[PDB]
């Protein structure tokens, strides 16, 4: 029942101002897991479990999205310690984050970018349907299950319950934040999400993000540094519309001409991932 008897703890995987994550194995079935520790003192957002339990908002959100759909890394279990919470998360093997993947490969071929972006969209839709807003969509928060060619969202440490009214707080990544936040400190969940997806898509096909400074975000002029098709440029520019109401809905994105004929995840892996080149 204690954490230490159910799981064998291994070396560090990663960390940050969000938490520290270790490799692990569930003793009962040898299932590979990831073990994330969060300091109670570093937690700003608290939530309530349906049985009235004070936990980190991150746990609340994870639980809501953690039914079997495989586009998010699921929370298998959690533990409370005197000064921390411990999250047991699934761990695909082999696995690589999208940030490292792009860095390794440079800009992605559009067929691959299409597959990846489509899966991210499906994963984000899943989250919204579960009443959860991620608020930090970016390459570092996306894992690739290399064998299956399936992408998985991680790190709901900056997330919130999804609502239809204005958010006046943001603790996600600034260069992925929309102009309305930069200018007015106000945004709506879905349209800000679409903005971040526009940045993500650009990063996929160009190998780097489009904006570095606040003035660039506010200007909203997108320059392409890599060869990118006219349909992909159009979708990107659309997602990066300065006015939130001018941005496409998720329906409109997925009905966009650039998005048609997406590969299945296993196809994607066979063509693009199972290779030395
Ligand atoms: N690659 C990589 C990879 C990606 C991120 C990290 C650090 C990190 C930081 C963080 O604040 N959070 N918050 C949640 C996760 C998480 O779920 N990470 C994770 C899960 C399964 C897995 F197989 C690998 C990482 C997480 N990871 C480590 C390894």
* Fraction of residues in H or I helices: 25-40%
Taken as a percent bin, the fraction of beta residues is 15-25%
Q: Could you spell the SSE succession in H and E letters?
A: HEEEEEHEEEHHEEEEHHHHHH
Gyration radius from CA atoms, angstroms: 19 Å
User: Spatial order of the strands in the main sheet?
Assistant: 1-2-3-7-6
Provide the list of bound ligands, each named once.
ligand 1OB
Give the second-level CATH assignment, the architecture of the largest domain.
Orthogonal Bundle
Give the total of domains.
Answer: 2
CATH homologous superfamily assignment of the largest domain: Transferase(Phosphotransferase) domain 1
Tell the overall outline.
globular
Task: Report the count of strand segments.
Answer: 12
CATH class of the largest domain: Mainly Alpha
What is the number of helical segments per DSSP (H or I, 4+ residues)?
Answer: 10
CATH topology of the largest domain: Transferase(Phosphotransferase), domain 1
By secondary-structure content and strand pairing, the structural class works out as alpha+beta
Main sheet specs: 5 strands, antiparallel
In whole angstroms, the N-to-C terminal distance is: 45 Å
Could you please describe the fold and organization of this structure?
This protein is an alpha+beta fold and 277 residues long. The chain has two domains: 1-93, 2-Layer Sandwich (Phosphorylase Kinase, domain 1), CATH 3.30.200.20; 94-277, Orthogonal Bundle (Transferase(Phosphotransferase), domain 1). The chain contains ten helices and twelve strands. The strands form four sheets. Strands 1-2-3-7-6 form a five-stranded antiparallel sheet. Strand 6 and strand 7 (84-90) form a beta hairpin. Helix 4 packs antiparallel against helix 6 and helix 6 (189-206) packs antiparallel against helix 8 (230-239). It starts with a helix and ends with a helix. Bound molecules: ligand 1OB. Residues 13-16, 18-19, 21, 34, 36, 73, 89, 91-92, 95-97, 143, 154-155, 157 line the site of the ligand N#Cc1ccc(Cc2cc(O)n3ncc(C(=O)Nc4ccc(F)cc4)c3n2)cc1. The ligand N#Cc1ccc(Cc2cc(O)n3ncc(C(=O)Nc4ccc(F)cc4)c3n2)cc1 binds at residues 13-16, 18-19, 21, 34, 36, 73, 89, 91-92, 95-97, 143, 154-155, 157. It is classed as transferase/transferase inhibitor. Keywords: PIM-1, kinase domain, Ser/Thr kinase, structure-based drug design, TRANSFERASE-TRANSFERASE INHIBITOR complex.
């Amino acid at each position: 029942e204690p954490l230490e008897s159910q799981y064998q703890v291994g070396p560090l995987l990663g960390s940050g101002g969000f938490g520290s994550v270790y490799s692990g194995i569930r003793v009962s079935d040898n299932l590979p897991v990831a073990i994330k520790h969060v300091e109670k003192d570093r937690i700003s957002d608290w939530g309530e479990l349906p049985n009235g339990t004070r936990v980190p908002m991150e746990v609340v959100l994870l639980k809501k999205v953690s039914s079997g759909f495989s586009g998010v890394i699921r929370l298998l279990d959690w533990f409370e310690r005197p000064d921390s919470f411990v999250l047991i998360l699934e761990r695909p093997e082999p696995v690589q984050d999208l940030f490292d993947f792009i860095t390794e490969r440079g800009a992605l071929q559009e067929e691959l970018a299409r597959s990846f972006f489509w899966q991210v969209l499906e994963a984000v839709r899943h989250c919204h349907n579960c009443g959860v807003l991620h608020r930090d969509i970016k390459d570092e928060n996306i894992l690739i299950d290399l064998n299956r060619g399936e992408l998985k969202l991680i790190d709901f440490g900056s997330g919130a319950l999804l609502k239809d009214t204005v958010y006046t707080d943001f603790d996600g990544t600034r260069v992925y934040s929309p102009p309305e936040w930069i200018r007015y400190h106000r945004y709506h969940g879905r349209s800000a999400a679409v903005w971040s997806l526009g940045i993500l898509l650009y990063d996929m096909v160009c190998g780097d993000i489009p904006f570095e400074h606040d003035e660039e975000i506010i200007r909203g002029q997108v320059f392409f540094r890599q060869r990118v098709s006219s349909e992909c440029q159009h979708l990107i520019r659309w997602c990066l519309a300065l006015r939130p109401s001018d941005r496409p809905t998720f329906e409109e994105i997925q009905n966009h001409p650039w998005m048609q004929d997406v590969l299945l995840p296993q196809e994607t892996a066979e063509i693009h991932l199972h290779s030395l080149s």
